[PDB]
Design a protein around this ligand. Structure first.
Ligand code: MG
Ligand code: MG
Ligand code: MG
Ligand code: MG
Ligand code: MG
Ligand code: MG
Ligand code: MG
Ligand code: MG
Ligand code: MG
Ligand code: MG
Ligand code: MG
Ligand code: MG
Ligand code: MG
Ligand code: MG
Ligand code: MG
Ligand code: MG
Ligand code: MG
Ligand code: MG
Ligand code: MG
Ligand code: MG
Ligand code: MG
Ligand code: MG
Ligand code: MG
Ligand code: MG
Ligand code: MG
Ligand code: MG
Ligand code: MG
Ligand code: MG
Ligand code: MG
Ligand code: MG
Ligand code: MG
Ligand code: MG
Ligand code: MG
Ligand code: MG
Ligand code: MG
Ligand code: MG
Ligand code: MG
Ligand code: MG
Ligand code: MG
Ligand code: MG
Ligand code: MG
Ligand code: MG
Ligand code: MG
Ligand code: MG
Ligand code: MG
Ligand code: MG
Ligand code: MG
Ligand code: MG
Ligand code: MG
Ligand code: MG
Ligand code: MG
Ligand code: MG
Ligand code: MG
Ligand code: MG
Ligand code: MG
Ligand code: MG
Ligand code: MG
Ligand code: MG
Ligand code: MG
Ligand code: MG
Ligand code: MG
Ligand code: MG
Ligand code: MG
Ligand code: MG
Ligand code: MG
Ligand code: MG
Ligand code: MG
Ligand code: MG
Ligand code: MG
Ligand code: MG
Ligand code: MG
Ligand code: MG
Ligand code: MG
Ligand code: MG
Ligand code: MG
Ligand code: MG
Ligand code: MG
Ligand code: MG
Ligand code: MG
Ligand code: MG
Ligand code: MG
Ligand code: MG
Ligand code: MG
Ligand code: MG
Ligand code: ZN
Lengths: 229, 112
RNA sequence: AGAGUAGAUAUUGUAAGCUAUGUUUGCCACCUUCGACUCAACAUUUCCUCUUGGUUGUAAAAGCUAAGAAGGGUUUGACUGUUCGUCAAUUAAAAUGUUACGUGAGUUGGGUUAAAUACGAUGUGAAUCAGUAUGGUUCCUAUCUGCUGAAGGAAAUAUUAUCAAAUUAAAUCUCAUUAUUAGUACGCAAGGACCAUAAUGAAUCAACCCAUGGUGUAUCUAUUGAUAAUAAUAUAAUAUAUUUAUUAAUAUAUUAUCUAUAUUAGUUUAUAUUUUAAUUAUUAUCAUAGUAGAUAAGCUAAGUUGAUAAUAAAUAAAUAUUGAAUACAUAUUAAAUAUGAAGUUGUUUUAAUAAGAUAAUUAAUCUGAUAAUUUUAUACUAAAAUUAAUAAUUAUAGGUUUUAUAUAUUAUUUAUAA
RNA sequence: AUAAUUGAGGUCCCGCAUGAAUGACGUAAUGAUACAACAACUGUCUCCCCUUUAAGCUAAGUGAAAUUGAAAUCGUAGUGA
RNA sequence: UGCUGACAUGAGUAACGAAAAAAAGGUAUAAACCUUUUCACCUAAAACAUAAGGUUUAACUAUAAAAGUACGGCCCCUAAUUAAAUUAAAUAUAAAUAUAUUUAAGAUGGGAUAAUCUAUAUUAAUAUUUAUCUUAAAAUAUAUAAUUAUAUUAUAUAUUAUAUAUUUAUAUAAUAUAAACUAAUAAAGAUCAGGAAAAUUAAUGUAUACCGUAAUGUAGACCGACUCAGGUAUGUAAGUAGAGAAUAUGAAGGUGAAUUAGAUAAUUAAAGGGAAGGAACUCGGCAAAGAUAGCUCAUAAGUUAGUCAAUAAAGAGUAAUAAGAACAAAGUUGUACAACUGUUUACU
RNA sequence: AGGUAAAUAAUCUAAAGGGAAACAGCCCAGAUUAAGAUAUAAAGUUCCUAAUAAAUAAUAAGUGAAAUAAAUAUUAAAAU
RNA sequence: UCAUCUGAUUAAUUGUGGUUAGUAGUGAAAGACAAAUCUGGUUUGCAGAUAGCUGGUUUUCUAUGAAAUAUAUGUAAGUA
RNA sequence: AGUAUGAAAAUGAUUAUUUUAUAAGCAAUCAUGAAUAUAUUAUAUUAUAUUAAUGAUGUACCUUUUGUAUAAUGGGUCAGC
């Protein structure tokens, strides 16, 4: 009751409802901006919900599965824009995370908001699809977009990629088919380059992407450690 | 409960500015953004790049505006007859001039 | 003087004598709130505990009186506004003061106190009272000092990281009962020890949460009323596909479960008619967390554990040795030589400080800070943990997995199958 | 009556200084009146503990007040309107 | 404790006024504005209609539309009351003025007609307060015309079928829920005994004036120096529940705010729980705790005879046995004073 | 009684300066403005703090050293 | 304000307007109310009321410089 | 509440000089080092100015009083009256 979670200056009933709302909004819009503390708590709920959904999907035990389903239902507000949220959770969202052991969200810190000095953050779903089956781009996966923008900038400058950038790319890849990842990167480039107004010679960009993928995939002192005399 | 004397210039100033707690600190923890080579806070996203990405998302993930057929296919004269102009209130006018009271985000300096 | 079986000075001490105190009642006029609660600090003129002198009135045991002694301790209830006092039950003892008769910018407001009112008395009366009774008004965010904690800056017998002694500031220091020595010493008997040790407690302090108890707006179950969802199923419509001969049948998606008319004015409900206008699973909200039964961590005392800090040194009152000055005597206010206290010095504990010590010394990873994730810590700070991802090793928080706990049904079961 | 009662009720009458429409006396009912007792209940207390929310604390924005001769505003004792 | 002005100090301290918010987008300008969705709060209101009031605050200047019928004023009429008014000499009076009488004013009240819509002008001629019972009537069932038990009992309209004037009129018959509520009717109980004032036929008329109308109105738009937890009149106030306008919920509607974000030490406030004890607290049980039906039964002493005491205490039935919404319901007694219900120091 | 009432003198009142630790009233002494060599007042002369050396006795109690505490007791010392 | 408590068909609560007040009304009577408070409102005027009382009264230099006693006083805070 | 002007002060921020982190009280005066600045006769071993090394002395002002550092009166500061 003290120390188990953030209180967030709200009465228990209100607080829980707020958290549910945040979770619903995260599932609907695959990224959302909010205050840092709220985002942190919301992540805990959303991740829990995702795991329960995964458990329901997997389990052979019928009773268990039913219980998981009931728990998931309890943890959401299913109305208006979130009428078919349960369906989405089972069919669209939870199947992304079957291999991933936890860590389905990422809270990314922003510069604190000016009017309030409140620490601001971006709660968002990990490995959200950047491109739907229709020829558009999807709202979400901000980190990936940022990475690709950084890559583009490095290419423009004719500089080597930073170790941190490479590490991030590797992390992104870990639960991604290589060809799919490449195609996503290419798609992101097309939009990003146009926005920034750099020229998109396609074959060269593809080659660069391929090169970036290759280095990611193929893995390759002051004090001396000496035994006791 | 109440101050016994007029607090002097010295004693108010040493109270306010003497302690380091009360002073402002240099923001040493700035560093370069990898997407655009500009200043940003450490362990923080660049507000320009994330803003740009948000804008891109908005432009792509855009719910189409509902233009009713009957109003779209009105004649100009007919439209004027139906929906004439009006004097807005002082309050309304003030609300309309958003650039007076609404702060757009500033761009940081380019890192060296 | 005089009591004290005898003897003024064991104990008592008329009236008169000489002082101290500023604790009472006064006097002076420089100067214009009693009690309770809470926390106490100081004194010693000591009530208890430790040491000791005297006590034909110290046999013993209880006492009485006096000297040293302030380390520790010194009460709970009935009555009353009361301090006090009376009593009850305890205690080793229930000491006396000082501190603006400590403490109302810390609490209270019963007493005292103004407005209302009544009573007794006084007065022709308005009204009055060293009277009685019921009722009844002040508030304050802390500038400075001070104190409790916590940081930053700093000058360091010159650096940093760590370990740190003397020292300083404080804390602590006990007491009871029982048992043994011993029914011994002592005493006719009745009664009944010192010296000393141990064990149980005590009051106080400190830490702790394994367990116990409490809590537990983590959680789970049960449960009354009202409302609102999702899913499934049925019906209907629209949109998209497939079959069929735009229609019908199928599949997917979305939306819908209304509506209108009758029953003599109005409202609601009911049924009938009208319409495609559905009843099961599972959720949620609200009603003090809706109420109730349990309840993890944490925190806590009703709980648990430990401590009351020795040995030692010099002393107080007091008790001696030898021994003159002074042929004796005299513990010395002589030279020498000894005993002696819950006190003193210390010891023990905490905080502060940092003499000293080990090491490294312009740095591909020197030491710190800013930043992030945090809790061992915490108002903010500070402190401590981690900031791994390369040749090795290092998990901070969440998430995940795990076993375990909680909840409450469960072998009338779960999983594999034949 | 209570372990124990300056309170309460009953009774006595040196009524300091009761008494008959400034009414006297005893009742039923009533009373947010005043005092006292019993029951039940309880954090009132023994003896406090845990929890909740709003403040307090920190950051951002706005922004009081009484007060103030001037202040570079320590302890003790003494002195002294 | 001079007056006026300016500027300090406390201090960037307290405070920012009962409050539930979240996301996405308008907008790579939003904690605060607008929209959408979610969540919550008010709901015999924080809703919807209005009265009064007011810097028009409004959905605004291209601005709140009336001949009259569940439309108000204006107008007619008057109450309370008011009037340099009214009557050789109304009466009185140092002046001012006052009195009586007339006339005039004066709403908070009364005021014809109306959907089968309605016609207001001119001229002429003679109602305090409360109640709807019992009986009786017929209707529906049980038993053998008459008894027993149960509802129903004055009015409010559509339908169908008849009989008369001639598909429009009049009357009759039959058909048809419950619970509230309205108006209009009738009969009538009580003492406290219940406003005032302004005709009818006939003929001729009637081209329908002025003002109010926004929004706000248990409130940021009025009265409180403030966008002030105060004060402020009336009517509707979805259903489910209930004796109910109590209480719970909330369909719809409205709202979520000139402060936010975090942290939640000490400490304060307002709540929830608490082992063993149970008033040991305290001036004092102050505060808190305490309800084993709320319906139907039953209910003592005393007593002024009044179920006054009584809503008696205890207790029963229905319900429930481990408990499991809110709200109503919080003991018994003795004494002093005052019969009682009332009134009082707006702010001790 | 730092009391009260008057008598006499002084000071303060209205008087600064030195001393009395600090000091309205006590001990000295009266600031016209400076200067700082010489006489000094009261009070002082180990240091704080301007200035000191002696003589003869007494005390041993830190008595006392600028605010004298009594009766009485004990121990000495002189003189008769 | 919150909780608690009391009345709640009556000597009830309340809207709209009216009457009665500054020697002065209303008052189930408290000296209670009469426009944020009355043993008698407010405003304007008499009016610069009066104050033996409190406080204040503004540059410099120079010379002299007290008193706090007696008597009287409805006088002992004054005045001769 | 005219119009111009405004190095009037209180008051705020900033810079420069100087002093200040082992020192205690009306914050001044006098003694006295040092540092800085200015100086068309500093010829210098110079002169002025500014500045809390260090030392000594120093109980705000007024009012009212027998008598006030008084913890008696009155004043937040400056400008005008
Ligand atoms: Mg709730
Ligand atoms: Mg939960
Ligand atoms: Mg004798
Ligand atoms: Mg005697
Ligand atoms: Mg003995
Ligand atoms: Mg003694
Ligand atoms: Mg000791
Ligand atoms: Mg008691
Ligand atoms: Mg006292
Ligand atoms: Mg005090
Ligand atoms: Mg005080
Ligand atoms: Mg009372
Ligand atoms: Mg010991
Ligand atoms: Mg425990
Ligand atoms: Mg445990
Ligand atoms: Mg347990
Ligand atoms: Mg526990
Ligand atoms: Mg009807
Ligand atoms: Mg249907
Ligand atoms: Mg609600
Ligand atoms: Mg113990
Ligand atoms: Mg001898
Ligand atoms: Mg001998
Ligand atoms: Mg000892
Ligand atoms: Mg790394
Ligand atoms: Mg860990
Ligand atoms: Mg590992
Ligand atoms: Mg982890
Ligand atoms: Mg008695
Ligand atoms: Mg009592
Ligand atoms: Mg009489
Ligand atoms: Mg009487
Ligand atoms: Mg009454
Ligand atoms: Mg702030
Ligand atoms: Mg003096
Ligand atoms: Mg002045
Ligand atoms: Mg402060
Ligand atoms: Mg503060
Ligand atoms: Mg604050
Ligand atoms: Mg936005
Ligand atoms: Mg209600
Ligand atoms: Mg409205
Ligand atoms: Mg008229
Ligand atoms: Mg009217
Ligand atoms: Mg209107
Ligand atoms: Mg309207
Ligand atoms: Mg107003
Ligand atoms: Mg006000
Ligand atoms: Mg208001
Ligand atoms: Mg309702
Ligand atoms: Mg609703
Ligand atoms: Mg509204
Ligand atoms: Mg607000
Ligand atoms: Mg308890
Ligand atoms: Mg219990
Ligand atoms: Mg007591
Ligand atoms: Mg009570
Ligand atoms: Mg009877
Ligand atoms: Mg009740
Ligand atoms: Mg009465
Ligand atoms: Mg009152
Ligand atoms: Mg005298
Ligand atoms: Mg004088
Ligand atoms: Mg003198
Ligand atoms: Mg003289
Ligand atoms: Mg002279
Ligand atoms: Mg001495
Ligand atoms: Mg002396
Ligand atoms: Mg009653
Ligand atoms: Mg009646
Ligand atoms: Mg009176
Ligand atoms: Mg007034
Ligand atoms: Mg009055
Ligand atoms: Mg005159
Ligand atoms: Mg005058
Ligand atoms: Mg002279
Ligand atoms: Mg004289
Ligand atoms: Mg005189
Ligand atoms: Mg006089
Ligand atoms: Mg120094
Ligand atoms: Mg100082
Ligand atoms: Mg002072
Ligand atoms: Mg003063
Ligand atoms: Mg003052
Ligand atoms: Zn950037």
């Amino acid at each position: 009751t003290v120390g188990i979670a953030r209180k967030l200056s709200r009465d228990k009933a209100h607080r829980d409802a707020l958290l549910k709302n945040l979770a619903c909004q995260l599932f609907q819009h695959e990224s959302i901006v909010s205050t840092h503390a709220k985002c942190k708590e919301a992540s805990r709920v959303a991740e829990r919900i995702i795991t329960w959904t995964k458990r329901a999907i997997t389990t052979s035990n019928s009773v268990a599965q039913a219980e998981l389903k009931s728990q998931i239902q309890s943890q959401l507000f299913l109305a208006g824009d979130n009428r078919k949220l349960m369906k989405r959770l089972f069919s669209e969202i939870a199947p992304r995370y079957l291999e991933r052991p936890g860590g389905y969200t990422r809270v990314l810190r922003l510069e604190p908001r000016a009017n309030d000095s409140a620490p601001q953050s971006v709660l968002e779903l990990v490995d959200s699809p950047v491109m739907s089956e229709s020829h558009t781009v999807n709202r979400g996966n901000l980190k990936m977009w940022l990475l690709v923008k950084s890559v583009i900038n490095d290419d423009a400058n004719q500089l080597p990629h930073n170790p941190l950038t490479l590490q991030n790319l590797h992390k992104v890849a870990k639960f991604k088919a290589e060809a799919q990842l490449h195609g996503e990167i290419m798609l992101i480039k097309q939009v990003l380059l146009k926005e920034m107004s750099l020229p998109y010679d396609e074959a060269l960009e593809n080659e660069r992407t391929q090169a970036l993928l290759k280095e990611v995939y193929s893995s390759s002192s002051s004090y001396v450690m000496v035994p006791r005399p | 409960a109440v101050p016994k004397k007029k607090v002097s210039h010295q004693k108010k100033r040493q109270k306010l500015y003497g302690p380091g707690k009360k002073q402002l600190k240099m923001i040493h923890h700035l560093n370069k953004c990898p997407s655009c080579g500009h200043y940003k806070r450490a362990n923080t996203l660049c507000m320009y790049c994330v803003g740009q990405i948000s804008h891109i998302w908005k432009t792509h993930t855009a719910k189409e505006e509902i233009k009713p057929r009957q109003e779209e296919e009105l004649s100009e004269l007919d439209q004027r007859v139906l929906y004439p102009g009006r004097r807005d209130t002082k309050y309304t006018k003030d609300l309309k001039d958003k650039d007076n009271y609404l702060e757009r985000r500033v761009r940081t300096l380019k890192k060296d």
